[PDB]
RNA sequence: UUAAUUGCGAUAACGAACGAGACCUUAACCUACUAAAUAGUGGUGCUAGCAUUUGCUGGUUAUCCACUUCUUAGAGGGACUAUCGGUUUCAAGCCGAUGGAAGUUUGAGGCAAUAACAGGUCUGUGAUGCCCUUAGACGUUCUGGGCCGCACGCGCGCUACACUGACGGAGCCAGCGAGUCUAACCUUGGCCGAGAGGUCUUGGUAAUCUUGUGAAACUCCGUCGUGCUGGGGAUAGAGCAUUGUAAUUAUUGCUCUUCAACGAGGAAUUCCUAGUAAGCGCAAGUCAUCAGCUUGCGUUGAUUACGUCCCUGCCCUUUGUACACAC
């Protein structure tokens, strides 16, 4: 009803858009260990996208009158567009910025 | 699908049984604010008074409120079956009452006074401020006050 | 007794419980322009309560302003009819 | 008029009480187990021992004593319970018997190693594939310590233990 | 003449031997019968702490007893009846014969 | 892991050492003659022995 | 006297005891065998109880 | 006599027997048409074989299913398994084998568990835990 | 083509039959109605309160049309539920027996069910006819 | 190389044993065998209702007839990493795909070596040495209290902090199991009672009766509406019942009323890799009564690795040791 596109196209666009491409990880030889930046696999991209979307929808619908379904709809639409209002896109950009800083 | 606009005689917080009862919430759970009146009792008296339970308490008439008050103040007169009552076979007269807003505290207190002056175990317990229903005191009721 | 928490209060909205003519004709003129209409919409927009929102949704679908597409309980989904 | 579950656990408890009674009473006669065959017209109890002559006594006197004890204790009718005695095959292939022999030797005063090695020699002579004897407790001191005497090979794991090993 | 023979053993091999000899006897005498109906083998479980005392890892032990129950229905004269109850006995196997 | 033990391997080696003008590259008939020509207590071990004999005969067909 | 064994023993842990060890604690009352758990672990293979799993 | 088969579909602990004969195309479940299986969505989950192979192949045959055991979801999965297997049995015994091959190919190309039962079974419960693998909680101090 | 109770959804049938009974207004209501919870495990009484005895009776009628024989015990088991025991974990508690007993007595007096051998209550012929006709109309309401 | 001193093999070692594995139990396959009103199915008789045009849904113990797909078992079969392709001194073996019910030693368990702990237990034992005590006894037994006692500190848990929700109606599905004799168990059905429960009967010594254990979570319709609120339900008052000789420091159950903290939990820390975690309840154990516990059972059923030795530990080899109650 909102965003008359195919909603399956909408969700796959959301997944493609909120998939963190670069991420950090502890690498070291012992006491000399740092958080180094690395690529991200596509399967982990998909999984992290789904997790971020669902967690944002959940903690949005929590303790408020809106429903889990319409919160998830908000999340998916804003993620397919690219918003910086969605929990998912915000976390994505945070992680990518951190990995850029820790190259 | 019922939309009647309303006429502005609606009232917010009202007063009865010396309790500032809230409007803007349905009458059953509004009346629950009255100490001595719970969900069952209030639902039952609001059924016996034949007031619509879909109505908000602030949207009601003084005659309805007085009917409800009269019922809860002498409920057995209106075919209430004598086991909904908080004080039945009381302790002195053997009749069945139903205490309300301030009478609940006064009656609890005179019960404790009876037990204390009798030096009963439960009265001594209440006086000392401990648990009386036989619970274990070793791990609970630590910062009880 | 240390709680290990923050305990930040909120604003405590006061959504309406019963309506009048101003809220009614605001509803009647504003439930169009809404591409998606449900209780959440009729509370984040017009500050009526959820009960009033349920009743108003049934009412408007009676007249025919909002079109239903699925009336599953706990989630009523309406669009605007043109 | 009893359920089959309780009937069978009662059968088992009966067998166990009989086994304990006989291994307390006939220890000096090589009691190497008992069988219980119930039947129409009676229940028969087949003791398997070595000194059948001493189990019988004179004129079956002790057998009569034991029949009467069993009957009086287990509420049987006179004649519905019978006791038979049988010379056990393969005396060396019976752990309870060799353990009782060890017990009587150590009580008469024989030495631990002499007794245990006599037992293991008799067993491995009696057509066995392996035997093990463990004596544990106070041996020539206050501090206790075990002594494992063995010959041949033994197994410890699997269903072959329940099948072949006698403990 | 409506006899039921129920066998309520713990030993599957002895029970099946008894059933086989009974049915072949009835078959060489040519007696109509309902074959050996095998009821669900019922498992008697007992769960116990392995230890006498209380200390140690809480290790549990489940002992089982499997009770196997068979029944056969025969139409038979009194002579074959009395001889069948005469015979078909083995240790550890309990039998119950009932008429009607 | 599917590593065979020395019981299986020795049994297969003996079966090949004295029944070669015989059992072939087929597990089924090799099994159906293993139970014919050897005393094995368990079907599982019989089938393991048959499988290893088939593997060794495949090896023998090439060198 | 008539107060030597006065107190009833119709129920509770005093009405039962192991038929072997004469103990009130740890009874197996299932299937009417009434044996302490320890003596049951001792006599199970005799009674016909075995471990399979 | 009439051409008749009887099959079973299975799940964790539910079994759905299915009598399949020649008829006029009625598909009942325990007393009732196929449109009242009562999750309202696994209804579409159970329509699947019909919707795949075309309802023309159900016009000449009567199907009647009796389900017991399990819960609602497992009963639905058993129903659809039994329906598919009974259809294949009918087409194997009375219709020729080419139709059986095409039907089986369609069913397995959509979903493998339509004809073959899920071998997943409950793992037993072990002491020291509330479940098979879980343990209770370790306390050190 | 013929129809039966088993060809229509249970919710639709029960709603239609309860409306039929409430409009007919002859079955019964004992008098302790509008007081009771229907279960020792429930926390509040029913919310409609302008009926619900007809709903219970329609549900019982469908149940006995389906089954062969039932009793107040079976119906208490069926209509019971999880009693929230406050701070202790939940537990199945069976429903109130007087309710279903008087429902069955009223269904007898109106002639929808009868007492049966092997104990219990069974569906009668005129009650079967009534439920079948109500089901037919419940289905063809959708015209 | 393997889960594995499991194997390939190398070789001052050869040949063996124990453990591992093999084994046993269980769960999964068998429209192939044996059969079975103590499990079912179909048809035919009798019968109810709707349609009527054949039909659809049901009931029916002495209506029989036929059968065994589902259920029960007993004997057996089946998988052995089978076939194929890659990889490896080209050996053991490993990876992938196909087929198959099943291809992580098929899954889960049982059994489970040598050597030891000065682990626990004499409060399981009529198993026990020594010591003590042994008639105003530490024996035994009767009455009554206590083991619950609470300014506090820890551990296992149950309830929850709410709309992926509470409530009310409808819908409505399991499995592991227990049960009365010289007794009084599991209890259907009928009646009374708001409820708990009471009463008159009934069946079952049990695949037959309780019990399709009509479980709960679940789904569908409605009420509520972000408010410590109809969330949550401790803490208290009064009354009605049951168990038991006896409930008083409430045994438990039920009714009404009271309606506390709790707004997702700090430093820390536990369990877990698939029908598993988690949620959900049911049976049994203890038991006259008392589950918030345990042992098992099933119902709904995710996410995320399929890797590493960074922390905590284990195994083998080499190495150093001023250690041997052994960092
Ligand atoms: Mg919400
Ligand atoms: Mg679990
Ligand atoms: Mg319900
Ligand atoms: Mg819960
Ligand atoms: Mg018929
Ligand atoms: Mg190859
Ligand atoms: Mg294993
Ligand atoms: Mg001891
Ligand atoms: Mg204590
Ligand atoms: Mg613990
Ligand atoms: Mg509540
Ligand atoms: Mg609900
Ligand atoms: Mg069942
Ligand atoms: Mg740890
Ligand atoms: Mg219990
Ligand atoms: Mg107690
Ligand atoms: Mg305990
Ligand atoms: Mg791993
Ligand atoms: Mg150095
Ligand atoms: Mg030194
Ligand atoms: Mg140091
Ligand atoms: Zn004992």
From Swiss-Prot, chain B:
HAMAP family assigned: Ribosomal_uS13 (MF_01315)
Read off the PANTHER family from this record.
30S RIBOSOMAL PROTEIN S13/40S RIBOSOMAL PROTEIN S18, SMALL RIBOSOMAL SUBUNIT PROTEIN US13
Q: Where in the cell is it found?
A: Cytoplasm
What's the subunit arrangement here?
Component of the small ribosomal subunit (SSU). Mature yeast ribosomes consist of a small (40S) and a large (60S) subunit. The 40S small subunit contains 1 molecule of ribosomal RNA (18S rRNA) and 33 different proteins (encoded by 57 genes). The large 60S subunit contains 3 rRNA molecules (25S, 5.8S and 5S rRNA) and 46 different proteins (encoded by 81 genes).
Annotated family = Belongs to the universal ribosomal protein uS13 family.
Q: Does the keyword rRNA-binding apply?
A: yes
Name the PROSITE patterns for this protein.
RIBOSOMAL_S13_1, RIBOSOMAL_S13_2
Where is this protein primarily located?
cytoplasm
According to its UniProt entry, what is the function of this protein? Component of the ribosome, a large ribonucleoprotein complex responsible for the synthesis of proteins in the cell. The small ribosomal subunit (SSU) binds messenger RNAs (mRNAs) and translates the encoded message by selecting cognate aminoacyl-transfer RNA (tRNA) molecules. The large subunit (LSU) contains the ribosomal catalytic site termed the peptidyl transferase center (PTC), which catalyzes the formation of peptide bonds, thereby polymerizing the amino acids delivered by tRNAs into a polypeptide chain.
Processing and modification events after translation: N-terminally acetylated by acetyltransferase NatA.
Q: Origin organism of this chain?
A: Saccharomyces cerevisiae (strain ATCC 204508 / S288c) (Baker's yeast)
Which residues are annotated as modified residue N-acetylserine in the UniProt record? 1
Query: Where does it sit, as one GO cellular component term?
Result: cytosolic small ribosomal subunit
From Swiss-Prot, chain C:
Q: Where in the cell is it found?
A: Cytoplasm
Give the GO terms filed under biological process for this record: cytoplasmic translation
Q: Where are the transmembrane segments?
A: none
**Biased composition, Basic residues: where in the chain?**
1-7
Keyword Cytoplasm among UniProt keywords: yes
User: Which ranges of the sequence are coiled-coil?
Assistant: none
Q: Cite the entry's keywords alphabetically.
A: Cytoplasm, Methylation, Ribonucleoprotein, Ribosomal protein
Q: What is its main location?
A: cytoplasm
Query: Could you state a single Gene Ontology molecular function term?
Result: structural constituent of ribosome
Q: Which GO terms describe its cellular component?
A: cytosol; cytosolic small ribosomal subunit
**The UniProt record lists the keyword Oxidoreductase:** no
- What's the further remark here? It is presumed that the precursor part of S25 is engaged in assembling of the small subunit, thus being essential in ribosome maturation. Present with 322000 molecules/cell in log phase SD medium.
- What interactions and quaternary structure are annotated? Component of the small ribosomal subunit (SSU). Mature yeast ribosomes consist of a small (40S) and a large (60S) subunit. The 40S small subunit contains 1 molecule of ribosomal RNA (18S rRNA) and 33 different proteins (encoded by 57 genes). The large 60S subunit contains 3 rRNA molecules (25S, 5.8S and 5S rRNA) and 46 different proteins (encoded by 81 genes).
Protein family per UniProt? Belongs to the eukaryotic ribosomal protein eS25 family.
Q: Any idea what this protein is called? A: Small ribosomal subunit protein eS25A
| Protein species of origin | Saccharomyces cerevisiae (strain ATCC 204508 / S288c)
Curated annotation (Swiss-Prot), chain E:
**Superkingdom:** Eukaryota
> What does this gene product do?
Component of the ribosome, a large ribonucleoprotein complex responsible for the synthesis of proteins in the cell. The small ribosomal subunit (SSU) binds messenger RNAs (mRNAs) and translates the encoded message by selecting cognate aminoacyl-transfer RNA (tRNA) molecules. The large subunit (LSU) contains the ribosomal catalytic site termed the peptidyl transferase center (PTC), which catalyzes the formation of peptide bonds, thereby polymerizing the amino acids delivered by tRNAs into a polypeptide chain.
Q: Which family does it belong to?
A: Belongs to the universal ribosomal protein uS10 family.
- Gene (name only): RPS20
> What is the protein name for this chain?
Small ribosomal subunit protein uS10
Drop me one GO molecular function for this one: structural constituent of ribosome
Q: How is it modified after translation?
A: N-terminally acetylated by acetyltransferase NatA. Also partially acetylated by NatC.
Tell me what organism the protein belongs to: Saccharomyces cerevisiae (strain ATCC 204508 / S288c)
Output one GO BP term: maturation of SSU-rRNA from tricistronic rRNA transcript (SSU-rRNA, 5.8S rRNA, LSU-rRNA)
Swiss-Prot record, chain H:
Query: Which compartments does it reside in?
Result: Cytoplasm
Q: Which GO terms describe its cellular component?
A: 90S preribosome; cytosol; cytosolic small ribosomal subunit
Q: Which SUPFAM superfamilies match?
A: Ribosomal protein S5 domain 2-like
Q: Which PROSITE patterns match?
A: RIBOSOMAL_S9
Residues covered by region (Disordered): 121-141
Coarse class of the primary localization is cytoplasm
Alphabetic keyword roster: Acetylation, Cytoplasm, Isopeptide bond, Phosphoprotein, Ribonucleoprotein, Ribosomal protein, Ubl conjugation
Question: Which family is this sequence assigned to?
Answer: Belongs to the universal ribosomal protein uS9 family.
Provide the assembly information: Component of the small ribosomal subunit (SSU). Mature yeast ribosomes consist of a small (40S) and a large (60S) subunit. The 40S small subunit contains 1 molecule of ribosomal RNA (18S rRNA) and 33 different proteins (encoded by 57 genes). The large 60S subunit contains 3 rRNA molecules (25S, 5.8S and 5S rRNA) and 46 different proteins (encoded by 81 genes).
What other note does the entry give for this protein?
A: Present with 33800 molecules/cell in log phase SD medium.
Q: What is this protein called?
A: Small ribosomal subunit protein uS9A
The organism encoding this protein is: Saccharomyces cerevisiae (strain ATCC 204508 / S288c) (Baker's yeast)
């Amino acid at each position: 009803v909102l965003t008359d596109q195919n909603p399956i196209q909408v969700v796959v666009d959301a997944i493609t858009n909120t998939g963190p491409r670069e991420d950090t990880t502890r690498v070291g030889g012992g006491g000399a260990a740092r958080r180094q930046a690395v690529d991200v696999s596509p399967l982990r991209r998909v999984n992290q996208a789904i997790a971020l979307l669902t967690i944002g929808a959940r903690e949005a619908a929590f303790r408020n009158i809106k429903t889990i379904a319409e919160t998830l709809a908000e999340e998916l639409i804003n993620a397919a567009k690219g918003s910086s209002t969605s929990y998912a896109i915000k976390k994505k950009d945070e992680l990518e910025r951190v990995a850029k800083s820790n190259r | 699908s019922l939309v009647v606009q309303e006429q502005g005689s609606f009232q917010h917080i009202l007063r009865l049984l010396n309790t500032n009862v809230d409007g803007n919430i349905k009458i059953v759970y509004a009346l629950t604010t009255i100490k001595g009146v719970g969900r069952r009792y209030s639902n039952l008296v609001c059924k016996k008074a034949d007031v619509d339970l879909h109505k908000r308490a602030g949207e009601l008439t003084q005659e309805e409120l007085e009917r409800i008050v009269q019922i809860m103040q002498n409920p057995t007169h209106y075919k209430i079956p004598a086991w909904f009552l908080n004080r039945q076979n009381d302790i002195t007269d053997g009749k069945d009452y139903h205490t309300l807003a301030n009478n609940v505290e006064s009656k609890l207190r005179d019960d404790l006074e009876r037990l204390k002056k009798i030096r009963a175990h439960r009265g001594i317990r209440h006086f000392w401020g401990l648990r009386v229903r036989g619970q274990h005191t070793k791990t609970t009721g630590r910062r009880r006050a | 007794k240390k709680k290990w928490s923050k305990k930040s209060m909120k604003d405590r909205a006061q959504h309406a419980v019963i309506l009048d003519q101003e809220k009614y004709d605001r509803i009647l003129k504003e439930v169009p322009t809404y591409r998606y209409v449900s209780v959440s919409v009729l509370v984040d927009r017009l500050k009526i309560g959820g009960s009033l929102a349920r009743i108003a949704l049934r009412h408007l679908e009676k007249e025919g302003i909002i079109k239903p597409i699925s009336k599953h309980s706990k989630q009523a989904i309406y669009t605007r009819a043109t | 008029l009893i359920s089959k579950k309780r009937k069978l656990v009662a059968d088992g408890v009966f067998y166990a009480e009989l086994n304990e009674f006989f291994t307390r009473e006939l220890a000096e006669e090589g009691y190497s187990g008992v069988e219980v065959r119930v039947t129409p017209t009676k229940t028969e109890v087949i003791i398997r021992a070595t000194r059948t002559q001493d189990v019988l006594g004179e004129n079956g006197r002790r057998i009569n004593e034991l029949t009467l004890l069993v009957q009086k204790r287990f509420k049987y009718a006179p004649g519905t319970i019978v006791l038979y005695a049988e010379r056990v095959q393969d005396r060396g292939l019976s752990a309870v018997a060799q353990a009782e022999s060890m017990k009587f030797k150590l009580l008469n005063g024989l030495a631990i190693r002499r007794a245990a090695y006599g037992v293991v020699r008799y067993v491995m002579e009696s057509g066995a594939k392996g035997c093990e004897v463990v004596v544990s407790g106070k041996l020539r001191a206050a501090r206790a310590k075990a002594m494992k005497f063995a010959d041949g090979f033994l197994i410890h794991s699997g269903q072959p233990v329940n099948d072949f090993i006698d403990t | 003449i409506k006899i039921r023979i129920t066998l309520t053993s713990t030993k599957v091999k002895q029970l099946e031997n008894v059933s086989s000899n009974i049915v072949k006897n009835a078959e060489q005498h040519n007696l109509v019968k309902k074959g050996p109906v095998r009821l669900p083998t019922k498992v008697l479980k007992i769960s116990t702490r392995k230890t006498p005392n209380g200390e140690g890892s809480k290790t549990w032990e489940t002992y089982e007893m499997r009770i196997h129950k068979r029944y056969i229905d025969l139409e038979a004269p009194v002579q074959i009846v009395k001889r069948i109850t005469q015979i078909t006995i083995e240790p550890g196997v309990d039998v119950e014969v009932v008429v009607a | 892991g599917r590593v065979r033990t020395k019981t299986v391997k020795r049994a297969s080696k003996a079966l090949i050492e004295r029944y070669y003008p015989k059992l072939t590259l087929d597990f089924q008939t090799n099994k159906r003659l293993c139970d014919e020509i050897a005393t094995i207590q368990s079907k599982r071990l019989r089938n393991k022995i048959a499988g290893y004999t088939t593997h060794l005969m495949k090896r023998i067909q090439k060198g | 006297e008539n107060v030597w064994f006065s107190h009833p023993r119709r129920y509770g842990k005093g009405s039962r005891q192991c038929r072997v060890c004469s103990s009130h604690t740890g009874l197996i009352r299932k299937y009417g065998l009434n044996i302490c758990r320890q003596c049951f672990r001792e006599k199970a293979n005799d009674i016909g109880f075995n471990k399979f799993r | 006599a009439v051409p008749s088969v009887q099959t079973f579909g299975k799940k964790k602990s539910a079994t759905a027997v299915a009598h399949v004969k020649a008829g006029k195309g009625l598909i009942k479940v325990n007393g009732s048409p196929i449109t009242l299986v009562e999750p309202e969505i696994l209804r579409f989950k159970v329509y699947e074989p019909l919707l795949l192979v075309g309802l023309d192949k159900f016009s000449n045959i009567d199907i009647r299913v009796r389900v017991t055991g399990g819960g609602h979801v497992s009963q639905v999965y058993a129903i659809r398994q039994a329906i598919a297997k009974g259809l294949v049995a009918y087409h194997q015994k009375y219709v020729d084998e080419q139709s059986k091959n095409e039907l089986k190919k369609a069913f397995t190309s959509y979903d493998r568990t339509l004809l073959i039962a899920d071998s997943r079974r409950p793992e037993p419960k072990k002491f020291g835990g509330k479940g098979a693998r879980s343990r209770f909680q370790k306390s050190y101090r | 083509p013929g129809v039966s109770v088993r060809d229509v959804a249970a919710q639709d049938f029960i709603n239609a039959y309860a409306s039929f009974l409430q409009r007919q207004g002859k079955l019964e209501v004992p008098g302790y109605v509008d007081i009771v919870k229907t279960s020792s495990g429930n926390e509040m009484p029913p919310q409609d309160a302008e009926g619900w005895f007809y709903k219970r009776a329609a549900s019982v009628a469908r149940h006995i049309y389906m089954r062969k024989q039932v009793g107040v015990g079976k119906l208490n088991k069926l209509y019971g539920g999880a009693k929230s025991r406050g701070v202790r974990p939940y537990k199945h508690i069976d429903a109130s027996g007087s309710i279903n007993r008087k429902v069955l007595q009223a269904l007898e007096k109106i002639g929808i069910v009868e007492i049966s051998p092997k104990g219990g209550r069974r569906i009668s012929e005129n009650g079967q006819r009534d439920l079948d006709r109500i089901a037919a109309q419940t289905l063809e309401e959708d015209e």
